[PDB]
């Protein structure tokens, strides 16, 4: 009933301003029955509500953030946005946009976001983006093979197999932060040993912060 597509840089430098946008599909951002919300969650920390905005102009921002945050609605694009000034490492978080429906019998005003976007990670750092290097995990009834995705920044990378055709048996591990300050992960898949001679396996690694896409063929020997 609503789709919420989030966009914005995944890397922001300290003291600079973080901006995110939520593109809304399926309802109008000028409809007076909805309000629009941002929420965030730092890695391993709790959820923190940021605020709500109504098209009619009524807003309310968390007192923890009100002195640094603004929100706006762009009617021409059916979007709404978040602006957060003077960011620090405390502002590294996944940011969620959400829609709510005003209903004072079951909720105080603007306080029940009930359709959320899937979230976008923003990392506050002075470091530049770096795209990954991708190496094969070659196969030795069931065989395992994979791709090692090494030395990238910031998160995330996405990994698909055979351009998305291969999904059964895939495990893409959560990234680990190395002592170098760069991330690494592996993506693996188990397949029939009888397939290794005739099926081509390619891992597709996408790193949006660096506009990097890398394909790696994974074969025996």
């Amino acid at each position: 009933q609503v789709q919420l597509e989030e966009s914005g840089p995944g890397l922001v430098k300290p003291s600079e301003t973080l901006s995110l946008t939520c593109s809304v599909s399926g309802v109008s951002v000028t409809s007076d029955i909805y309000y629009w919300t941002w929420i965030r969650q730092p890695p391993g920390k709790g959820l923190e509500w940021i605020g709500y905005i109504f098209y009619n102009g009524d807003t309310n921002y968390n007192p923890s953030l009100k002195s640094r945050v603004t929100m706006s609605i762009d009617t021409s694009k059916n979007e709404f946005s978040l602006r957060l000034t003077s960011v620090t490492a405390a502002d590294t978080a996944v940011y969620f946009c959400a829609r709510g429906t005003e209903d004072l019998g079951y909720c105080s005003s603007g306080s029940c976001p009930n359709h959320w976007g899937q979230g976008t990670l923003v990392t506050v750092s002075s470091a530049s983006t770096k795209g990954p290097s991708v190496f094969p995990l070659a196969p030795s009834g069931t065989a395992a093979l994979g791709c090692l995705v090494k030395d990238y920044f910031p998160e995330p990378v996405t990994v698909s197999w055979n351009s998305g055709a291969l999904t059964s048996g895939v495990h893409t591990f959560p990234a680990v932060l190395q002592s170098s300050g760069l991330y690494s992960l592996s993506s693996v898949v188990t397949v029939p040993s009888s397939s290794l001679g005739t099926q081509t396996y390619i891992c597709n690694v996408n790193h949006k912060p660096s506009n990097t896409k890398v394909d790696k063929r994974v074969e025996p020997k």
Binding site: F96, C107, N114, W116, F135, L137, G146, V176, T190
Partner: protein
Amino acid sequence: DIVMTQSPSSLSASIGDRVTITCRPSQNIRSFLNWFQHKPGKAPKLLIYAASNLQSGVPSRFSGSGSGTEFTLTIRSLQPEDFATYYCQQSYNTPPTFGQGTKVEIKRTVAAPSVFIFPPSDEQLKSGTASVVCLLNNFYPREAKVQWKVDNALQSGNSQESVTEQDSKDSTYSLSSTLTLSKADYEKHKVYACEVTHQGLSSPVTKSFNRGE
């Protein structure tokens, strides 16, 4: 500013079990309390609003009760896809605030891991570093011991592990351990081995390769 205290922080229960999660706000909030489910990498989903109202599309095994300063989310029959972190959220006064969450994991039968070892690619060696990867696939429970040995000498301090979230259908885990060496150290030794101890294995499982064979 209203503080939400959820309990427990984490729990494990078998398929079919009745699960109970409690939330206590720091002041009375009438019935203005919502419950959310957050599966890894998915949009957080509203399960229950205003203490007891099941949201549209949510299965009826989820139910909320309580009012005032004590609220309960019950999962009446745990299903494998219910692996998630659950949160309470008060909607009584601004700002809305959330409990710190309850991590729900699924208990199931013991499943031994399948083990695989991967040598460093020749392409990586040109970079001066050698990564050796060990894979433990589709096991339960999550606890496992993975030791690296190079020419049967135990390694310490030069590996990192990563574990997948619990699988939403078979409730298993998979795990990678990655050994990082300089190319020079990698070429000074022959036998590279990952040794796996796990409750599903009667004795440890060792996978190995010989460099250059």
